Enzyme design. Sequence first.
Site, PDB file in Angstrom:
ATOM      1  N   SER A 158      -0.191   8.417 -11.711  1.00 59.30           N
ATOM      2  CA  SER A 158      -0.349   9.831 -11.453  1.00 59.30           C
ATOM      3  C   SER A 158      -0.648  10.182 -10.137  1.00 59.30           C
ATOM      4  O   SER A 158       0.234  10.148  -9.206  1.00 59.30           O
ATOM      5  CB  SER A 158      -1.099  10.404 -13.173  1.00 59.30           C
ATOM      6  OG  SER A 158      -1.393  11.461 -12.950  1.00 59.30           O
TER       7      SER A 158
ATOM      8  N   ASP B 273       5.569  13.876 -21.711  1.00 64.51           N
ATOM      9  CA  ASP B 273       4.800  13.800 -20.661  1.00 64.51           C
ATOM     10  C   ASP B 273       3.320  15.207 -21.370  1.00 64.51           C
ATOM     11  O   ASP B 273       3.656  15.644 -20.808  1.00 64.51           O
ATOM     12  CB  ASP B 273       4.299  14.059 -19.699  1.00 64.51           C
ATOM     13  CG  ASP B 273       3.227  13.345 -18.265  1.00 64.51           C
ATOM     14  OD1 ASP B 273       1.821  13.311 -18.678  1.00 64.51           O
ATOM     15  OD2 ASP B 273       3.813  12.444 -17.372  1.00 64.51           O
TER      16      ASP B 273
ATOM     17  N   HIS C 122       2.139   9.916 -21.441  1.00 62.42           N
ATOM     18  CA  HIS C 122       1.841   9.750 -19.593  1.00 62.42           C
ATOM     19  C   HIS C 122       1.010   8.325 -19.337  1.00 62.42           C
ATOM     20  O   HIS C 122       1.024   7.895 -17.965  1.00 62.42           O
ATOM     21  CB  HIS C 122       0.454  10.567 -19.270  1.00 62.42           C
ATOM     22  CG  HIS C 122      -0.241  10.425 -18.581  1.00 62.42           C
ATOM     23  ND1 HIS C 122       0.787  11.793 -17.039  1.00 62.42           N
ATOM     24  CD2 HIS C 122      -1.844  10.265 -17.466  1.00 62.42           C
ATOM     25  CE1 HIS C 122       0.176  11.753 -15.998  1.00 62.42           C
ATOM     26  NE2 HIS C 122      -1.220  10.876 -16.024  1.00 62.42           N
TER      27      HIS C 122
END
Length: 317
Positions: free
Chosen positions: A105, A187, A224
Amino acid sequence: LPSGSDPAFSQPKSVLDAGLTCQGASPSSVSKPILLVPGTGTTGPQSFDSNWIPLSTQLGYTPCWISPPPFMLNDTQVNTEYMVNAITALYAGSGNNKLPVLTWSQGGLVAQWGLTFFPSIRSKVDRLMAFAPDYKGTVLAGPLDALAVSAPSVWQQTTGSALTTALRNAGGLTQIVPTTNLYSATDEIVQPQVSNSPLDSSYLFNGKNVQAQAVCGPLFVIDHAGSLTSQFSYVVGRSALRSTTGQARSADYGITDCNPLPANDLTPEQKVAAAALLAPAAAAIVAGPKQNCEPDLMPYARPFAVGKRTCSGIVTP
Ligand SMILES: CCCCCCCCCCCCCCCCCC(=O)OCCOCCOCCOCCOCCOC
Ligand SMILES: *[C@@H]1O[C@H](CO)[C@@H](O[C@@H]2O[C@H](CO)[C@@H](O)[C@H](O)[C@H]2NC(C)=O)[C@H](O)[C@H]1NC(C)=O
């Protein structure tokens, strides 16, 4: 792409060194190191000890990681300092040998911000394996910014922010070193990621952009966290780190690797932990610092975001 000398560190070197730690080694005498950069609301171990710390150890690397305080919630430009300092150290410590960087991320955004504005590390970074990176931020943070409940890095990770604008205008939406971007259309944190085109947050021009659903089909769902911990993600990561091109090879992964559950080589204990990856992150975000504006861009990045508004006002050169 910016050139010249590296911008000065705003933080004391002593503080940046305290954020760097390697497993079974010191950065000044490490062998075959791999720098791991964590996601928002976590520390290096929180993001990776249930996945890439043990997995990269199995591939023969000495996992190292940075833990910028507090839980990657502060200014992304500062979090980048921890990484730039880490790479300089590990490179010298490994006998002046390039090393791979593995991110999750925000860590991906941090890595690209560093490569774009600090020229000296471009020759020290072997390749970049990013899972669910948000180079263009996310639209989902928008509401939080409106209610003034967003941490410094959340504002910056907001689509259209001064930070992501500066990255784009500097030429950071095109790879600098061989990059593989694994991400998912499903996501729940980072969006848009649905088009499997340059419109996606994780897309880098010239990069090996791998959207999970493009290989595994629309019914393949990994959120995610799954983008980092799943068996499919492991197969693409292993491909990227072994590849002679510096990028994952299509020939190394396929439909048979489409397992959404944590990597097979993880212990039953690690899989459970990897499955609850988002819990600590959400907790840190909920309890962390909050503000009603985006942190100011440092001098070096200002010329690339003229007109945007940060805490001090409209940006100008
Ligand atoms: C369980 C949370 C799922 C909620 C789905 C709606 C999306 C809202 C979350 C957007 C937050 C944006 C964070 C910045 C984007 C990049 C994040 C990153 O680097 O990876 C780290 C993982 O992030 C974990 C975020 O998940 C926690 C979000 O939930 C917090 C919601 O609580 C809001 C209360 O106000 C603080
Ligand atoms: C979090 O980020 C802020 C914003 O960049 C950092 O604050 C700067 O720190 C340097 C060194 O102390 C100062 O010279 C600047 O004046 C500060 N600017 C602002 C706007 O505060 C802060 O040091 C970082 N926090 C942590 C906990 O690492």
